[PDB]
Design an enzyme around this catalytic site. Structure first.
Site, PDB file in Angstrom:
ATOM      1  N   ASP A 197       0.814  -1.210   0.000  1.00  0.00           N
ATOM      2  CA  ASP A 197       0.000   0.000   0.000  1.00  0.00           C
ATOM      3  C   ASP A 197       0.850   1.264   0.000  1.00  0.00           C
ATOM      4  O   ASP A 197       1.918   1.294   0.621  1.00  0.00           O
ATOM      5  CB  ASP A 197      -0.913  -0.011   1.228  1.00  0.00           C
ATOM      6  N   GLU A 233       1.802  -0.638  -4.827  1.00  0.00           N
ATOM      7  CA  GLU A 233       0.809   0.297  -5.308  1.00  0.00           C
ATOM      8  C   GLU A 233       1.470   1.641  -5.515  1.00  0.00           C
ATOM      9  O   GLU A 233       1.810   2.319  -4.549  1.00  0.00           O
ATOM     10  CB  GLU A 233      -0.380   0.451  -4.380  1.00  0.00           C
TER      11      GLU A 233
HETATM   12  C1  LIG Z   1      -7.864  14.113   7.870  1.00  0.00           C
HETATM   13  O1  LIG Z   1      -7.639  13.147   6.809  1.00  0.00           O
HETATM   14  C2  LIG Z   1      -8.426  11.912   6.928  1.00  0.00           C
HETATM   15  C3  LIG Z   1      -9.327  11.712   5.668  1.00  0.00           C
HETATM   16  O2  LIG Z   1     -10.218  12.795   5.583  1.00  0.00           O
HETATM   17  C4  LIG Z   1     -10.152  10.364   5.845  1.00  0.00           C
HETATM   18  O3  LIG Z   1     -11.003  10.108   4.710  1.00  0.00           O
HETATM   19  C5  LIG Z   1      -9.125   9.165   5.944  1.00  0.00           C
HETATM   20  O4  LIG Z   1      -8.298   8.970   4.748  1.00  0.00           O
HETATM   21  C6  LIG Z   1      -8.578   7.727   4.126  1.00  0.00           C
HETATM   22  C7  LIG Z   1      -8.665   7.949   2.581  1.00  0.00           C
HETATM   23  O5  LIG Z   1      -9.734   8.869   2.245  1.00  0.00           O
HETATM   24  C8  LIG Z   1      -8.983   6.554   1.929  1.00  0.00           C
HETATM   25  O6  LIG Z   1      -9.106   6.637   0.489  1.00  0.00           O
HETATM   26  C9  LIG Z   1      -7.873   5.447   2.261  1.00  0.00           C
HETATM   27  O7  LIG Z   1      -6.685   5.794   1.563  1.00  0.00           O
HETATM   28  C10 LIG Z   1      -5.848   4.777   1.406  1.00  0.00           C
HETATM   29  C11 LIG Z   1      -6.214   4.009   0.084  1.00  0.00           C
HETATM   30  O8  LIG Z   1      -7.272   3.221   0.227  1.00  0.00           O
HETATM   31  C12 LIG Z   1      -4.986   3.164  -0.409  1.00  0.00           C
HETATM   32  O9  LIG Z   1      -5.209   2.456  -1.528  1.00  0.00           O
HETATM   33  C13 LIG Z   1      -3.771   4.100  -0.551  1.00  0.00           C
HETATM   34  N1  LIG Z   1      -2.906   3.867  -1.527  1.00  0.00           N
HETATM   35  O10 LIG Z   1      -1.871   4.685  -1.634  1.00  0.00           O
HETATM   36  N2  LIG Z   1      -3.559   5.185   0.355  1.00  0.00           N
HETATM   37  C14 LIG Z   1      -4.542   5.506   1.407  1.00  0.00           C
HETATM   38  C15 LIG Z   1      -3.816   5.221   2.761  1.00  0.00           C
HETATM   39  O11 LIG Z   1      -3.526   3.886   2.885  1.00  0.00           O
HETATM   40  O12 LIG Z   1      -7.667   5.366   3.729  1.00  0.00           O
HETATM   41  C16 LIG Z   1      -7.337   6.647   4.398  1.00  0.00           C
HETATM   42  C17 LIG Z   1      -7.137   6.341   5.869  1.00  0.00           C
HETATM   43  O13 LIG Z   1      -8.317   5.890   6.442  1.00  0.00           O
HETATM   44  O14 LIG Z   1      -8.218   9.385   7.130  1.00  0.00           O
HETATM   45  C18 LIG Z   1      -7.400  10.642   7.044  1.00  0.00           C
HETATM   46  C19 LIG Z   1      -6.494  10.772   8.303  1.00  0.00           C
HETATM   47  O15 LIG Z   1      -7.262  10.764   9.512  1.00  0.00           O
HETATM   48 CL   LIG Z   2      -4.229  -1.213  -5.741  1.00  0.00          CL
END
Ligand SMILES: CO[C@H]1[C@H](O)[C@@H](O)[C@@H](O[C@H]2[C@H](O)[C@@H](O)[C@@H](O[C@H]3[C@H](O)[C@@H](O)/C(=N/O)N[C@@H]3CO)O[C@@H]2CO)O[C@@H]1CO
Ligand SMILES: [Cl-]
Ligand SMILES: *[C@@H]1O[C@H](CO)[C@@H](O)[C@H](O)[C@H]1NC(C)=O
Ligand SMILES: [Ca+2]
Length: 496
Positions: A197, A233
């Site tokens: 990731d 990734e």
């Molecule tokens: C304040 O920022 C907040 C965001 O608003 C909140 O949506 C979330 O961010 C989410 C984000 O939107 C999602 O797409 C997802 O993002 C992950 C993706 O699913 C993953 O495929 C990735 N690849 O580089 N990078 C990201 C970190 O592993 O997981 C993070 C963490 O849960 O957590 C952050 C930190 O608390």
């Molecule tokens: Cl992926």
């Protein structure tokens, strides 16, 4: 890095996104094994933050608390049971390894985690690992916010916080060791490889240093000296300084240009047409085939969370999705990953899905079991794209033609194309607004072949369309633009 470690002949992995361990294990035995699937990419098996605002979103799993195999998908005993049962049936397991970071720096301290482990983001305290302030890049990152702000600066992309996520100091042998400890624990359990990731957010050299500490695959299931499959990734659509090519020394990389472009083509955006797919692959500025992990959509972009744009095709676009997946599975470029998702209440407002955070089907936060319907589809809101006849048969098509060259390409100069794979398979697509009726050179031996899209070969007969190949390899194909599935595929194993 570069070998999937799948059981000879099996050429695809399926992403059982958010599936519980017990369900995957059963799926391995009842479906994946018989249907010829190579393996399964599982959601992060390590303990994550339990996020209640919004309610248990899928993304909470990308916010690590520790490396304990304890999540909503199950505990360690359940994980090991899954890996064992899947391996015993010749179906591999690939772990989604979240090693670039821990949780969001704004997350409240406490025990709001999937295994009850205590953690304090504010003080960089993760005693369950254990990690401390000295294990993060707070002092290394040079941005004023401490977060990644500009993707034009390759340094901050690696040393700063991705959307606030505490960035681990991967240069430290201790941190690299704790990660390898986690990964080796998984390897010794039986996992065949990993999805790294956020690899774009890690230095190629740090990933390399971590990989050097990994064991070979478990000798109870794999031959001696087997190295775990590694697919990093790296979201690289070009236009940025970081190139996924910088990561080739570690293993394969995700080719996000694949689905982004295939989507624009099938949706016919910007004047794009299927006839242009003749030189599909490296000809489109893609990474080398042997270093590519391809897919139409992934867990991120199917809900607008990664990169690819609104061009990405998903199960929501069933008809066009089946065609894209079929093209991907028929084409020799890269190693294929099939997506398997869950339905959620997509609610578009001002061009964006306000429910893109919705986690997997659940009852009070407990993920629902995957139920199987009599028609082989799934219930409980699981989409199970991998079970769709059109996709499942194309997965098999890929196994049957494995190793065969791309040949006998045809195109009408617009959106009706066709091609074969040596003398083992042939596929025809009609994405124009008019019918396709023509005799094409298939490269296949004479006989009657079952179209595996509209039907199946069962009891020596075809349940759907039948194609008749003459003595000089030709066969007539007729596909209306109004057909359920505007494509036909036949192969050596669908021959009567
Ligand atoms: C304040 O920022 C907040 C965001 O608003 C909140 O949506 C979330 O961010 C989410 C984000 O939107 C999602 O797409 C997802 O993002 C992950 C993706 O699913 C993953 O495929 C990735 N690849 O580089 N990078 C990201 C970190 O592993 O997981 C993070 C963490 O849960 O957590 C952050 C930190 O608390
Ligand atoms: Cl992926
Ligand atoms: C195929 O189906 C027909 C009936 O449609 C039947 O006569 C024939 O025996 C079947 N072939 C096999 C091999 O079962
Ligand atoms: Ca980083």
């Amino acid at each position: 890095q570069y070998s999937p470690n799948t059981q000879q002949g099996r050429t695809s992995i399926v992403h059982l996104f958010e599936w519980r361990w017990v369900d995957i294990a059963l799926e391995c035995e009842r479906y994946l094994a018989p249907k010829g699937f190579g393996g399964v990419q599982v959601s992060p098996p390590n303990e994550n933050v339990a996020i209640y605002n919004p309610f248990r979103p899928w993304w909470e799993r990308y916010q690590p608390v520790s490396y304990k195999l304890c999540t909503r998908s199950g505990n360690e005993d359940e994980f090991r049971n899954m890996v064992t049962r899947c391996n015993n049936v010749g179906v591999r397991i690939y772990v989604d390894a979240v090693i670039n970071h821990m949780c969001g720096n704004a997350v409240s301290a406490g025990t709001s985690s999937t295994c009850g482990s205590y953690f304090n983001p504010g003080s960089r305290d993760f005693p369950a690992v254990p990690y401390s302030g000295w294990d993060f890049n707070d002092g290394k990152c040079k941005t004023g916010s401490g977060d990644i702000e500009n993707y034009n600066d390759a340094t901050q992309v690696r040393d700063c916080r991705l959307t606030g996520l505490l960035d681990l100091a991967l240069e430290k042998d201790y941190v690299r060791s704790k990660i390898a400890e986690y990964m080796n624990h998984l390897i010794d359990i039986g996992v065949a490889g990993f999805r790294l990731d956020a690899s774009k957010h890690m230095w190629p050299g740090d990933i390399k240093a971590i990989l050097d500490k990994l064991h070979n695959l478990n000798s109870n299931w794999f031959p001696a000296g087997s190295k775990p499959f590694i697919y990093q990734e790296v979201i690289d659509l070009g236009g940025e300084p970081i190139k996924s090519s910088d990561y080739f020394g570690n293993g394969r990389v995700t080719e996000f240009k694949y689905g982004a472009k295939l989507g624009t083509v099938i949706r016919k955006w910007n004047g794009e047409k299927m006839s242009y797919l003749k030189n599909w692959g490296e000809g489109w500025g893609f990474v080398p085939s042997d270093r590519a992990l391809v897919f139409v959509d992934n867990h991120d972009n199917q809900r607008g969370h990664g990169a690819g744009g609104a061009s990405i095709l998903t199960f929501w676009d069933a008809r066009l999705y089946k065609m894209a997946v079929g093209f991907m599975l028929a084409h020799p470029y890269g190693f294929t990953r099939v997506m398997s998702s869950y339905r959620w209440p997509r609610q578009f407002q001002n061009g964006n899905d306000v429910n893109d955070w919705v986690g997997p089907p659940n009852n009070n936060g407990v993920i629902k079991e995957v139920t199987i319907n009599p028609d082989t589809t799934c219930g409980n809101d699981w989409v199970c794209e991998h079970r769709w006849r059109q996709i499942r048969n194309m997965v098999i098509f890929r196994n049957v033609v494995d190793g065969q060259p791309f040949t006998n390409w045809y195109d009408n100069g617009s959106n009706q194309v066709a091609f074969g794979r040596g003398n083992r398979g042939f596929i025809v697509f009609n994405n124009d607004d008019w019918s396709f009726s023509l005799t094409l050179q298939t490269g296949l031996p004479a006989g009657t072949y079952c179209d595996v899209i509209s039907g199946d070969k069962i009891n020596g007969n075809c349940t759907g369309i039948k194609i008749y190949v003459s003595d000089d390899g030709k066969a007539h194909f007729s596909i209306s633009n109004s057909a359920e599935d505007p494509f036909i595929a036949i192969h050596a194993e669908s021959k009567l």
